[PDB]
Design a protein around this ligand. Structure first.
Ligand code: MG
Ligand code: MG
Ligand code: MG
Ligand code: MG
Ligand code: MG
Ligand code: MG
Ligand code: MG
Ligand code: MG
Ligand code: MG
Lengths: 58, 59, 86, 115, 64, 81, 139
RNA sequence: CGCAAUAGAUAUAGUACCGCAAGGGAAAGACAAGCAUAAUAUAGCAAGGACUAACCCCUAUACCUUCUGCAUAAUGAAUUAACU
RNA sequence: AUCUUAGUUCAACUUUAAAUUUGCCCACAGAACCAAAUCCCCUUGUAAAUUUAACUGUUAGUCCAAAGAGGAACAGCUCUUUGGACACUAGGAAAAAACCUUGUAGAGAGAGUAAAAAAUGAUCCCAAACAUAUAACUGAACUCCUCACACCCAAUUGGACCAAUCUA
């Protein structure tokens, strides 16, 4: 084929070369820094923030 | 003007004694002239941190 | 600072506007051949060019609009004569 | 309350005393307006911020050209206090497809070729 | 819920030739060249709009 | 205290602006066309411009993907010998 | 303990290195070094505007001194050198006043000449021939 | 793809010690802050622009959190290290 | 709306991805019998708007101009409405969130401007002065100049990178 000819002049494939397909492994989000975490997205004081808002549909 | 280093430096920053009569002069005008001269704000070489102020003698 | 005077004498208010100072080439080579022009000059040529193209385009559109109005006045004022016969 | 202002048309009536005071003429008016902004959109109502954003006058002085037709004047009569309008003057005619890249606008409002 | 697409999936060989052919074949229908994606790795050609039956017929004519 | 004492410099600044806007008044009392003459003369350009906007908005789609880019990542172990 | 920062030392020294020259406990205690270093860098950024403003005011002062040495205020010198179409700026005017006294003497003479021409013209009736130095040169 | 002496068991120990009692319940073993060498010199969020020059000149209302913005209006922080 | 006003849910506003084609401004015409303006669209200047999929966050703020109702037409007073600003940058009025000037961000030991100066009761007055040498100059992070550019909002939302440790 065409690509199979490309592989001949590249380095050997091994577990040091692999990669995920771009766009698959979305990066993670952690509350650290001035953007992600100062209130970590939970908003001002209120039962929204503490994780105590009424049941779904109240 | 081809002066050596130290003589040139001394000539440029030297202090000059300015007389200033005051007969029938208002205090404010004498004050303005004295302020300019004491501060060094009549020397093209002026700066605040160079101590270019001169002497004034008001009689 | 004489911007009032400079504008009273058909000059740019700002000596760094348009004049010999800002647009003549700041340097040449020693031998005499000119230098690759400066970025600011290129950008000002581009913007003045766009200004001129816009000027010509708007003027053309307005003139064509006047001509179209003339044509419509002809074909509505005269085609009523075709109903004035028979 | 504070409301849009409808300017009476009586003001936009050049007099025989105004005509010889500026370089204009009732008959044979001028094609294009060259307009510049000389005042901030800030501290003014939104129905002037939007107008200025529409006439391309976002940046400061930076002159810009517009037609002299009432559809645009109606917009300039709302922002007439944040702009200077001068009439473009062409004492050498519209440039050709040559001389487009060698034009220049002088402070008097005349577009000319090759400086 | 509003992006319609079609995929020609098991394409083998030069997928760009097929892209040119599909663009020629569809351009008259839509009244403009149809935007497309080529994924030369998986070997697929993705096309905006719903053209499943047309493409099936066309790939039948050419003998696939 | 609360009242102010409007200076002369402020008066001159205000008169400058008043004169500029009076000139603006003058340059707006003489339009090249009238309401009816202008009508439609820009229709073609407006239609084409909005069609350009439409064609731009309706062209979004993922970018292509090439085998060469994927296989280039094996270069991260290229060695001399 | 699964993960522990093993290099907090370098992150501290990145901020202390900019504080060795401070005075007090706030040159070795991070909790205070950080706040004062941040204020230092904010002033460092915000001070360039003042640098330009201050050098310009120093130049205006020096030029006023030099021009007063020749019986000519500073409004006159600048407001009537431009009327002679000399685009010398203020940095170089100050440098001339300090380091080239006679050139500055000539410039002051030119300014006084143009000032006199202006007064004579405005005093007259009409558009009598312009002054020998008051003739503009067009581009 | 479990911890490695503030972790991992509370553990060298349910000992020492606290409590009348039920009961509670530790610590640890292998040039950081603080000081000295070397007290200070008009002026002021302690710095910045700088400068030949450390000060002198010009600029400059500490940080977090909560109230509509808060001069410090109020709350919190002596400071270092580890854990959070 | 809520045994609700120290909170929640829905809406409005915000964000992302996606689809499509009209969205805003707007003259003339038009909207009742019993002052400011408003609504609606052809054109025109523009490039945005609607729709779909998916989440969080804010919500009953202060001051100024104006028109009203309550307390005098006052009490720096409660409330409704149109607009601006603030909670974002910078320069001015002495200090100064709310007045005036100004926004899209970096380097410069360059330049032009904006606003901006007063007239004729209780600790200790409070810049110093100046009647008459030609009106211009000074003045920003606004604008121009040489170079470089993603590199100045809270809550929230999207994205690009990454310290140290373990494993292959
Ligand atoms: Mg997680
Ligand atoms: Mg300046
Ligand atoms: Mg232990
Ligand atoms: Mg233990
Ligand atoms: Mg130590
Ligand atoms: Mg105190
Ligand atoms: Mg305390
Ligand atoms: Mg309409
Ligand atoms: Mg800018």
């Amino acid at each position: 084929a065409r690509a199979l000819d490309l592989l001949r002049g590249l380095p050997r494939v091994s577990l040091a070369n692999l990669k995920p397909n771009p766009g698959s492994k979305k990066p993670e989000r952690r509350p650290r820094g001035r953007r992600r975490g100062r209130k970590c997205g939970r908003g001002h004081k209120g039962e929204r923030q503490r994780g105590t808002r009424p049941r779904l549909g109240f | 003007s081809s002066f050596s280093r130290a003589p040139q430096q001394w000539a440029t920053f030297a202090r000059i004694w300015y007389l200033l009569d005051g007969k029938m002069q208002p205090p404010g005008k004498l004050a303005a002239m004295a302020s300019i001269r004491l501060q060094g704000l009549h020397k093209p070489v002026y700066h605040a941190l160079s101590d270019c102020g001169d002497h004034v003698v008001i009689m | 600072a004489g911007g009032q005077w400079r504008l009273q004498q058909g000059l740019a208010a700002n000596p760094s506007g348009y004049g010999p100072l800002t647009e003549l080439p700041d340097w040449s080579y020693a031998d005499g051949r000119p230098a690759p022009p400066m970025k600011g000059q290129l950008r000002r040529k581009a913007e003045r060019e766009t200004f001129a193209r816009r000027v010509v385009l708007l003027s053309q559109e307005m003139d064509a609009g006047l001509q179209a109005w003339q044509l419509r006045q002809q074909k509505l004022q005269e085609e009523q004569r075709k109903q004035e016969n028979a | 309350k504070f409301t849009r202002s409808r300017i009476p048309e009586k003001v936009f009536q050049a007099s025989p005393e105004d005509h010889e005071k500026y370089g204009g003429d009732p008959q044979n008016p001028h094609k294009l307006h060259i307009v510049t902004r000389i005042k901030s959109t800030r501290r003014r109502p939104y129905w002037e911020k939007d107008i200025i954003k529409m006439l391309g006058l976002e940046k400061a002085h930076t002159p810009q050209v517009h037609k002299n037709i009432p559809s645009v004047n109606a917009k300039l009569k709302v922002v007439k206090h944040l702009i200077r309008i001068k009439p473009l003057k062409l004492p050498q005619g519209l440039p050709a497809e040559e001389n487009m890249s060698n034009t220049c606008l002088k402070s008097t409002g005349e577009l000319v070729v090759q400086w | 819920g509003n992006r319609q697409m079609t995929v020609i999936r098991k394409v083998e060989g030069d997928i760009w030739a097929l892209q040119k052919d599909v663009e020629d074949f569809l351009s008259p229908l839509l009244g403009k060249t149809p935007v497309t994606q080529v994924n030369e790795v998986t070997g697929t050609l993705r096309i905006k709009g719903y053209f499943d039956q047309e493409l099936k017929a066309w790939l039948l004519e050419k003998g696939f | 205290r609360r009242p102010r004492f409007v200076s002369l410099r402020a008066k001159q600044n205000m008169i400058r602006r008043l004169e500029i806007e009076a000139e603006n008044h003058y340059w707006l009392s003489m339009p090249y066309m009238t309401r009816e003459q202008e009508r439609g003369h820009a229709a073609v350009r407006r239609r084409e411009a909005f069609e350009a906007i439409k064609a731009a908005a309706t062209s979004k789609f993922p970018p292509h993907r090439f085998i060469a880019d994927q296989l280039d990542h094996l270069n991260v172990t290229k060695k001399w010998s | 303990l699964r993960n522990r920062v093993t290099d907090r030392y370098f992150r501290i020294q990145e901020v202390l290195k900019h504080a060795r020259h401070f005075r007090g406990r706030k040159n070795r205690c991070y909790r205070l070094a950080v706040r004062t270093v941040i204020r230092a860098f904010v002033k460092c950024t915000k001070a360039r505007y003042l640098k330009k403003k201050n050098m310009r005011t120093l130049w205006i002062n020096r030029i006023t001194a030099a021009s007063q040495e020749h019986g000519l205020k500073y409004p006159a010198l600048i407001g009537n050198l431009v009327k002679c179409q000399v685009e010398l700026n203020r940095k170089v005017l100050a440098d001339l006043a300090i380091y080239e006294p006679k050139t500055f003497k000539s410039l002051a003479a030119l300014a006084s000449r143009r000032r006199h021409e202006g007064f004579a013209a405005a005093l007259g009736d009409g558009k009598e021939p312009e002054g020998i130095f008051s003739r503009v040169v067009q581009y």
